[PDB]
Amino acid sequence: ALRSCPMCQKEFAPRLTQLDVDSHLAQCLAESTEDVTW
Amino acid sequence: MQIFVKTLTGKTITLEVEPSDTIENVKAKIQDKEGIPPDQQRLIFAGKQLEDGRTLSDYNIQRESTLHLVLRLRGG
Amino acid sequence: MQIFVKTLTGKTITLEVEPSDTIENVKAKIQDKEGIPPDQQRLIFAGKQLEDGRTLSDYNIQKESTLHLVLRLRG
Ligand SMILES: [Zn+2]
């Protein structure tokens, strides 16, 4: 589903696979000092 | 069925699971293999942070699916 | 000898080590205490990233030295 990252608002282009998106999300979550929900 | 859990350093953990296994079960398996306490694990798949009480099938996780694992340090 | 490993979450980990211990050995000790796999640990001392095959004495790390531990975001 996700069309943009809920943490950093980067837009997810259609060329990105689900794996790419999950990987991006993981990095954004890890970089945040607090636990985030979305 | 086999799934993969990928860490941020690129390491891949392979797990045998059932579609009805809960996310907590999965974290416990990760602990068994890697020694990481579940409370320090966060899992991501299909645009979602996976919740402990839900099942793999709830998230459409299937054979050879790749989940992403993020670790947290203890706080305090 | 004792060294201190600080995290940005405000935790200080105290470790008992020898000067001849390798960084790999130190990471294993941190895993024992904190449950973080060594491949996910980055250790920094005096602005320098510590390499696994080198020893504490190679970096002039001495009693009551403070290292920093940060989690890796990339391989
Ligand atoms: Zn992001």
Side-chain angles (χ1 to χ4, degrees):
Chain A
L2 286 187
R3 307 207 330 115
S4 68
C5 179
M7 283 162 284
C8 78
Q9 288 67 49
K10 188 268 221 296
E11 349 183 342
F12 297 138
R15 71 183 171 275
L16 265 37
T17 64
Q18 178 175 143
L19 181 91
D20 298 332
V21 165
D22 285 349
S23 171
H24 169 100
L25 294 172
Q27 296 180 246
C28 268
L29 187 59
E31 217 253 350
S32 90
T33 45
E34 292 295 354
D35 272 317
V36 200
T37 313
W38 64 82
Chain B
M1 67 176 182
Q2 193 164 256
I3 63 171
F4 303 119
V5 180
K6 189 179 253 187
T7 69
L8 291 179
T9 57
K11 168 145 154 47
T12 300
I13 303 160
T14 303
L15 273 23
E16 207 60 33
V17 297
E18 306 220 38
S20 55
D21 288 346
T22 58
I23 299 306
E24 44 194 307
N25 169 85
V26 170
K27 292 178 178 177
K29 293 180 142 147
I30 290 169
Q31 182 181 35
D32 292 343
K33 288 185 190 267
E34 263 48 37
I36 309 157
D39 283 347
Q40 292 181 245
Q41 297 180 33
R42 311 288 183 269
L43 292 171
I44 296 168
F45 184 76
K48 296 283 193 56
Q49 199 166 169
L50 306 186
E51 304 177 82
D52 285 352
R54 294 170 77 143
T55 63
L56 297 176
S57 72
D58 283 336
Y59 289 111
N60 197 217
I61 288 161
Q62 306 165 82
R63 79 185 271 292
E64 292 203 310
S65 287
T66 298
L67 290 51
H68 299 257
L69 168 65
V70 172
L71 267 27
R72 301 290 195 198
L73 267 11
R74 299 154 58 207
Chain C
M1 66 182 186
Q2 259 167 350
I3 63 172
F4 305 118
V5 182
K6 284 174 64 197
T7 68
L8 289 179
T9 56
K11 198 148 178 336
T12 299
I13 304 161
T14 303
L15 294 175
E16 186 69 24
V17 298
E18 296 302 335
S20 53
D21 287 346
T22 60
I23 298 306
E24 192 187 1
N25 195 82
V26 171
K27 290 179 178 177
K29 295 176 190 276
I30 291 171
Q31 182 180 36
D32 290 344
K33 288 190 135 151
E34 295 295 317
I36 299 311
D39 61 77
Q40 287 204 211
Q41 294 180 35
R42 166 179 294 123
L43 291 171
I44 295 169
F45 175 66
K48 296 183 59 152
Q49 178 182 140
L50 309 185
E51 302 179 277
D52 284 353
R54 289 283 135 259
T55 62
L56 298 177
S57 75
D58 281 339
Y59 290 113
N60 295 295
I61 286 162
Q62 303 167 245
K63 99 188 200 352
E64 297 159 25
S65 286
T66 298
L67 290 52
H68 295 259
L69 168 68
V70 310
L71 263 27
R72 304 296 309 289
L73 300 172
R74 305 226 129 186

